[PDB]
Design a protein around this ligand. Sequence first.
Ligand SMILES: *[C@@H]1O[C@H](CO)[C@@H](O[C@@H]2O[C@H](CO)[C@@H](O[C@@H]3O[C@H](CO)[C@@H](O)[C@H](O[C@H]4O[C@H](CO)[C@@H](O)[C@H](O)[C@@H]4O[C@H]4O[C@H](CO)[C@@H](O)[C@H](O)[C@@H]4O)[C@@H]3O)[C@H](O)[C@H]2NC(C)=O)[C@H](O)[C@H]1NC(C)=O
Ligand SMILES: *[C@@H]1O[C@H](CO)[C@@H](O[C@@H]2O[C@H](CO)[C@@H](O[C@@H]3O[C@H](CO)[C@@H](O)[C@H](O)[C@@H]3O)[C@H](O)[C@H]2NC(C)=O)[C@H](O)[C@H]1NC(C)=O
Ligand SMILES: *[C@@H]1O[C@H](CO)[C@@H](O[C@@H]2O[C@H](CO)[C@@H](O[C@@H]3O[C@H](CO)[C@@H](O)[C@H](O)[C@@H]3O)[C@H](O)[C@H]2NC(C)=O)[C@H](O)[C@H]1NC(C)=O
Ligand SMILES: COc1ccnc2[nH]cc(C(=O)C(=O)N3CCN(C(=O)c4ccccc4)C[C@H]3C)c12
Ligand SMILES: *[C@@H]1O[C@H](CO)[C@@H](O[C@@H]2O[C@H](CO)[C@@H](O)[C@H](O)[C@H]2NC(C)=O)[C@H](O)[C@H]1NC(C)=O
Ligand SMILES: *[C@@H]1O[C@H](CO)[C@@H](O[C@@H]2O[C@H](CO)[C@@H](O)[C@H](O)[C@H]2NC(C)=O)[C@H](O)[C@H]1NC(C)=O
Ligand SMILES: *[C@@H]1O[C@H](CO)[C@@H](O)[C@H](O)[C@H]1NC(C)=O
Lengths: 138, 123, 138, 466, 466, 466
Amino acid sequence: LGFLGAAGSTMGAASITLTVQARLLLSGIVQQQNNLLRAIEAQQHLLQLTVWGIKQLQARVLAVERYLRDQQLLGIWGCSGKLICTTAVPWNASWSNKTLDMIWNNMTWMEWEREIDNYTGLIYTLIEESQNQQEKNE
Amino acid sequence: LGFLGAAGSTMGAASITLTVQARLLLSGQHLLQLTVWGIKQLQARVLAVERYLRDQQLLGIWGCSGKLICTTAVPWNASWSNKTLDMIWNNMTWMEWEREIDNYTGLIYTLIEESQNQQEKNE
Amino acid sequence: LGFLGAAGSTMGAASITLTVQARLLLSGIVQQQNNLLRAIEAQQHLLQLTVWGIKQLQARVLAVERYLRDQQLLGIWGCSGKLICTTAVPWNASWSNKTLDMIWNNMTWMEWEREIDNYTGLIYTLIEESQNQQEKNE
Amino acid sequence: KLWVTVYYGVPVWKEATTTLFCASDAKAYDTEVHNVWATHACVPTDPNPQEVVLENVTENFNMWKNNMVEQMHEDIISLWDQSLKPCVKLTPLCVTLNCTDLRNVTNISEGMRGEIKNCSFNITTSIRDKVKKDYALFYRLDVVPIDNDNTSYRLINCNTSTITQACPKVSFEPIPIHYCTPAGFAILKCKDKKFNGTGPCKNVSTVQCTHGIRPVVSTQLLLNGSLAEEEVVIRSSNFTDNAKNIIVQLKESVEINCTRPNNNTRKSIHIGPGRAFYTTGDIIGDIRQAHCNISRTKWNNTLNQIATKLKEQFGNNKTIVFNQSSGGDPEIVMHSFNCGGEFFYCNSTQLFNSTWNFNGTWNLTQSNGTEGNDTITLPCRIKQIINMWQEVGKAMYAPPIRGQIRCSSNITGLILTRDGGNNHNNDTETFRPGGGDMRDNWRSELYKYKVVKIEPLGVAPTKAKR
Amino acid sequence: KLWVTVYYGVPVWKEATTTLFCASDAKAYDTEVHNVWATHACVPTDPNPQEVVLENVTENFNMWKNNMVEQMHEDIISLWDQSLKPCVKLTPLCVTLNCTDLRNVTNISEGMRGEIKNCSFNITTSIRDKVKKDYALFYRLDVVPIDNDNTSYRLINCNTSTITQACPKVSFEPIPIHYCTPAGFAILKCKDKKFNGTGPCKNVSTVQCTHGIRPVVSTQLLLNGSLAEEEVVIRSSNFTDNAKNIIVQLKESVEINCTRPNNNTRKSIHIGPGRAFYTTGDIIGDIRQAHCNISRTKWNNTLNQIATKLKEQFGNNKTIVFNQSSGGDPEIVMHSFNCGGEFFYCNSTQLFNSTWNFNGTWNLTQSNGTEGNDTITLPCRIKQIINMWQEVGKAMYAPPIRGQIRCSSNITGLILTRDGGNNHNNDTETFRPGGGDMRDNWRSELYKYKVVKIEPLGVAPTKAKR
Amino acid sequence: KLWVTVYYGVPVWKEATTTLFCASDAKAYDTEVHNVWATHACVPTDPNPQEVVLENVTENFNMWKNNMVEQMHEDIISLWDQSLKPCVKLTPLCVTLNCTDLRNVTNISEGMRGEIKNCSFNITTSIRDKVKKDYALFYRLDVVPIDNDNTSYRLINCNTSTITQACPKVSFEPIPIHYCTPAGFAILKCKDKKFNGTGPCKNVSTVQCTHGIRPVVSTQLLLNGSLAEEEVVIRSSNFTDNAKNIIVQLKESVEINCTRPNNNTRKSIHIGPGRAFYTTGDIIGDIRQAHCNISRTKWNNTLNQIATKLKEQFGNNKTIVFNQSSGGDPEIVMHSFNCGGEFFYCNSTQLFNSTWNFNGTWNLTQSNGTEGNDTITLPCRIKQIINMWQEVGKAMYAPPIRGQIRCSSNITGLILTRDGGNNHNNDTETFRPGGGDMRDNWRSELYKYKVVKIEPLGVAPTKAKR
Ligand SMILES: *[C@@H]1O[C@H](CO)[C@@H](O[C@@H]2O[C@H](CO)[C@@H](O[C@@H]3O[C@H](CO)[C@@H](O)[C@H](O[C@H]4O[C@H](CO)[C@@H](O)[C@H](O)[C@@H]4O[C@H]4O[C@H](CO)[C@@H](O)[C@H](O)[C@@H]4O)[C@@H]3O)[C@H](O)[C@H]2NC(C)=O)[C@H](O)[C@H]1NC(C)=O
Ligand SMILES: *[C@@H]1O[C@H](CO)[C@@H](O[C@@H]2O[C@H](CO)[C@@H](O[C@@H]3O[C@H](CO)[C@@H](O)[C@H](O)[C@@H]3O)[C@H](O)[C@H]2NC(C)=O)[C@H](O)[C@H]1NC(C)=O
Ligand SMILES: *[C@@H]1O[C@H](CO)[C@@H](O[C@@H]2O[C@H](CO)[C@@H](O[C@@H]3O[C@H](CO)[C@@H](O)[C@H](O)[C@@H]3O)[C@H](O)[C@H]2NC(C)=O)[C@H](O)[C@H]1NC(C)=O
Ligand SMILES: COc1ccnc2[nH]cc(C(=O)C(=O)N3CCN(C(=O)c4ccccc4)C[C@H]3C)c12
Ligand SMILES: *[C@@H]1O[C@H](CO)[C@@H](O[C@@H]2O[C@H](CO)[C@@H](O)[C@H](O)[C@H]2NC(C)=O)[C@H](O)[C@H]1NC(C)=O
Ligand SMILES: *[C@@H]1O[C@H](CO)[C@@H](O[C@@H]2O[C@H](CO)[C@@H](O)[C@H](O)[C@H]2NC(C)=O)[C@H](O)[C@H]1NC(C)=O
Ligand SMILES: *[C@@H]1O[C@H](CO)[C@@H](O)[C@H](O)[C@H]1NC(C)=O
């Protein structure tokens, strides 16, 4: 429930006041589903190890691992706050010599990120440097 | 003082000592061979983790993101067993507060997160 | 990558520059390597309750436990922020009657951290009480 | 100038692999008796399915490299393995058998069938010193003559492998199963009316769980499966490569009425401490062979719909042939399936006997007043011992079921196999029944779904400075 | 007006269920001897127990639907199954036995007991080719007359149930166990002096872990168990219903001195590659029946203690009757327990033959002139083969123990069953020893504890705006 | 005045224990050698190892209570047990054997060796009434004489326990393994040129993964191991305690060329459904005994090196003695190892026959023109059945390998045993080959590494107020 419908929507149009509210609603729904799963299973004690029991345990471990990964990254470079977060690194236009308005009105998130993957390494490394910078400025 | 020592005392005094409970639920025989109690302990610790991170997630999703204390914007409805303040603070306990705020607690939770989304929309 | 090489250098000299620069190299690089290993492992699959699958499963479970525990510790006393955190607790000179210059430019971390292995519990509990007082004021 | 800005929770995913779990809501769990292997494990299904419709999306699909197929394939295999593992081992019953004809040569109602054999044999009891000469009943398909002797016989797979009987309490009635992903992943569903199995898809939807599959394994014809829409749809990895199989999905169900008209007695003999082999006691009344009832008109109409689409595939100017199966092991050569825990083997020769003329079809069988020779009766037989389809060994005996047995199910799909030869100018493309693969039955059901991992962190250059 | 204010870590808990793990202490791990029970699996117990007393709390308790009693029982059964799973299988030894009286007719010291039987038999050796006629000593309880005559015998369970002997290296000496909850849960302890098992409780404490239980399975009696303080407490699910079992807790220990006065030899015979059946070699000296020693005045003091509390329960004007169970299974009918890996069956008829009267009661035995007929001596016997109490299958064999066996334990509680009949105006309430249930032994141990989940998040209005 | 200030990520470790996992590069997986007792379960090793130099730390080490030794010990034990657990059971073959000379009395080329025995025997197959009189081949080491007639024989391990043959598809070639810790821990490496095994260390380096070990177990010798630097090094818990073993690390590799000059045929006989015992068909050509080729001068010079370090250890004025082992089980008494899936037992005499005098050494044999009696030939023999070293049960049979077998490896270390006696004024310290321990082989590898947990959080007063 609350899965984003902005997958077809153009990244920029979708990002402004169309996807931010849904993103947090989606997180709340997944949290409610996880709570429902953990309470029913505890009441049933049907979690005794068997092939299905191993398959569901692994899936839960993977899920928590993945979420913790995301939150871990998100915190460790200074965005402990909310989904949207600015940063200090100037965006070297060389990465994609393209203008903002056209990209926002025409490009979508999936096709956007797949031609950025080359420079994603560079931008993230520059970000960690900006964190270091501001921490040795304070 | 104590994991459940505050219980008998009123909610206001419980708030002062609410940090000793926050240290509990930490959720942390390094080898875990598939024998008997070893796996029992593994399953138990794996559950405890979900419990914490569930509560943690709600906090972050709400306007709180920070532990022990957090205030809100939803007005309290008369309908939700409204009394006074000396009543709901200096007279009665957290345990039996749940008794009358139980079908209401879910209504209150839905209210807080709808307002939190609404304030984000306004910002 | 980015491991601890400041142990030999006096606590103070490491604290002024090395701890700040290494912090991110210690928080991000280690986590990124773990994430890459997990992603390749999940795609490879072949994760059965064999002699080895159980070992690495417990390994990553221990890893997540230890990381989460540190975050809970920092979060409960107000270090929900980052590396550098002050406190309101005055350092009792009865615990350790040593001048700052000797503590910083003569003594390192391992030797010093062992010296407080009796006062440490008292210190932390006081940090919790001070945090509660700040909660009352705001 | 710009500074990068990040957005957690952007609509981005990536084709990936992961583990899945099942869901059996609560109807199976309510009975709490004769628990099936799937029932006591699956997590209750969420009452409200969520199917978010996606627009302006042309994601590519290819079912022949779908990871979830193989995963669920080894899932079902391991589940059966553990489900049957702890119960009885049948290795000591492998001796010589002294057998008569049926109950008696006194037959009214088919004659000498040979399907009971009243085989006698010497066996060792639970007490080591004690030994007893006992008798039991067996079908022709469950015994091989040995020693060139009319009286001598042995089980089929003694000199090959081992056998362990099915464990009597557990039921063999399938139930719907819903595969559900853990968080951070989603399943994409291609909702287009027609899809050939590989390519871009216009109608795309996002779900967290699949619809119930109700796992059924059959040879030649799909059963209790899903239906196509507005027409029959064919899927092949490479139509020019005749070596690969053909997948057929029908747009109407076809009712099939199979039964085992015999009153049976479950006589139980002990061969060990907990070892209690279950055999047939006797038969009350005449021995009528098991059979399936099928309508004629409906069959023609649906098979003619197939003919047109198959013609359309390989060029208009063709003549169609439906020869019977070449040969081999019993499953692929002759129609087989399961019903109430009894494995039926039906002779579907009369089912595939058709030669559509390039210029004789397009006229269905619209016989309104029928009231007669309208039911297609299938000669069906019983085999109690069944081995692993892929593994050479690992066999399993089927305990007899007391009383009368009858199922009625829904034929939803066929499995076809094109054979090349003198069909170039003849234009006589011949199709024979197929099977023998555990993956294809479910390939027929998983083509519409595919799993994607969800990567929410995204980056966007923006001129805002912190 | 008010705005809700969130608070993490508040005293709300909730009735709940969860999984628990044991603690055996560092010392059990330090001995590291044969992993008796689950010595290694158990986590080292915490040095400092934490028992935060809770005041102002009236929590209700009910031990008859406490789930951890069921949890503990299943855990014990699983641990025993794991211990006996790799043990030597004993199925082949089930043959006919050719038995003499015991050893010899040269009895002095009790006469014809029949407890050795020097049974001989024909058995296959490790090598299939060689078969050797061997012997073994067996108690009268172990072998039933079979095929009638006089000289044919066989084990009690053969066709009925398989047997696997106890592995020799492991020991059965129980050790204290501490159940400990994972984080987010707690155990509540009702600390009141007298509790009838269900109702509100005044004195309450939250504890990190339960005290050592040292699980002991015994019938008609409770050994090595917790003692009620300052009173004797009688508990039952339904006092009105005679069928419901009655549990009696005691306020003093009673010392019991059981022994097996026989010097034994462990003769070991191979029946397979790793199969090494262990039997008794012979007996050095005279054969004396096992005998438990018990003081008179002390047991009587406790019989009077039961009486008073019992006639305070069912109305003053009653006459009390103590009768043994007329019909029962061998474990149920008479007293049985374990000692040094040897299962004793004692005839507790002299502990349950008392007719307390309404008048003349309340005077205790203050006999200062003792030094004599002051020991209740119990006729005790040995059974080596014991079967699952509940499941009709899965029997074990007890290997013999060399040398002398002696125990001295601590009698702390009773199980009694009320029987109804001509007791209305007679007022002759009759009570009989009970047992045969694995749960009841631990129902008394876990009565004061109950588990609760802890939910930290609470919400309360306050006028502070953010 | 000061207020404490907290830091997250200070350089503070602590002595600790934890679990580790492996990393077998990709090369074994790139070859698909079908899971050689530890392949597909390992994670791919990181391309770029990170060995951070430590400065100004004198961390103490002690290898004799390093836990990872024991951990990896039991790891190897369970890893081997689970590989041979699912394949063939080899109990039924234990019968009497009727055996000839070798294959034939026609011997050219050594004479009466007795190493083939052409043993015949009656056995039972899958079908259990068709007894089969079959033959096979066995070595003199594999078969014991029971009944000292002439041609009456049995497999040595039928009194002890059970046998299960190695499962043919899996190979035995070891591959490098890298132990890697989970996050929050590190491994410290003592990089000093010479280390006695216990004490402070000057050169320290933190890695996260150990270098490949390539697990190899051998007795009296160390093979394809690691090398010392500039000198032979010598380690012992208590040198005075002659009871403890002595580990010797070498500074040069020594080439060893072992071979099995016999063309072999793998004749396969079924004894069950899936039971297919593999035996030797025959030998093509002459029977040349397996042997190992070793250079003289290298061995002499390296033995000189050890002697000098040993007369630095126990005082200069000594005379050195190298007597052969005392006795016992085959492994430690005479040299043994593995090669291409065949366990060789080489007669170690010519190696340890040396009495380097107090006044006769210090001249290495630098023989230039040799071209002759320069190769040390080792009489080596074959045993196919090998048991557990410590436990008495759990034995395996090694299937024969077809064709020619030949390995060439690098000797790198020694195990020795000091024997005391009349050596005080004689000064004739005598040392013999050792072995029989699984730990020591790896103690020789893991001496340099030790694990430490990392706790990042540290406190320090500072005058800054919040
Ligand atoms: C456990 O403790 C109990 C309590 O002490 C023991 O049982 C008690 O036994 C005494 C008798 O020893 C009994 O007292 C009798 O009570 C009856 C009713 O209250 C009275 O009828 C009786 O008076 C006389 O008559 C009885 C026959 O009707 C005689 O049996 C009895 O001995 C009395 O005999 C009188 O006359 C003779 C001869 O002149 C004289 O020697 C006697 O002293 C007496 O004057 C008694 O008052 C208690 O009622 C019993 N109590 C209970 C609870 O049963 C029991 O033995 C102890 N068990 C063990 C193992 O030690
Ligand atoms: C219980 O029954 C067993 C049989 O299962 C008896 O064992 C047998 O006892 C006889 C008599 O002592 C033994 O024969 C003797 O052997 C010695 C030594 O060679 C010889 O000197 C004597 O003349 C006589 O032949 C026999 O070996 C022995 N067998 C075994 C397997 O132990 C046993 O004596 C009986 N014990 C009692 C107490 O009744
Ligand atoms: C391996 O290395 C050792 C070390 O050199 C060789 O040992 C010995 O070498 C010396 C010098 O050749 C021999 O000394 C002889 O001493 C006797 C009495 O003192 C006398 O005849 C001469 O003075 C002579 O130099 C010595 O015999 C010899 N062995 C001893 C006992 O030390 C050894 O030869 C080398 N080779 C092999 C294959 O063993
Ligand atoms: C004989 O094996 C077994 C048979 C049955 N159950 C078992 N359970 C563990 C086993 C072992 O692991 C073992 O005892 N083994 C000895 C050490 N070993 C070697 O490689 C080796 C052998 C000889 C000389 C030097 C090294 C591995 C293995 C063969 C084991
Ligand atoms: C439990 O509740 C009682 C009743 O309020 C508390 O007893 C009072 O405590 C206050 C302050 O400690 C005293 O001033 C009163 O005189 C006490 N008695 C009363 C009000 O009757 C008690 O302290 C509470 N204990 C806990 C642990 O919560
Ligand atoms: C280890 O100790 C040595 C000796 O003090 C350090 O070497 C000197 O370090 C200081 C400051 O760290 C420099 O000013 C000197 O120039 C260095 N040279 C000398 C005199 O040796 C070394 O840096 C220390 N290593 C660490 C980083 O712990
Ligand atoms: C960005 O700059 C490069 C300079 O080489 C130019 O070639 C490219 O066309 C520019 N992008 C656009 C779309 O203007």
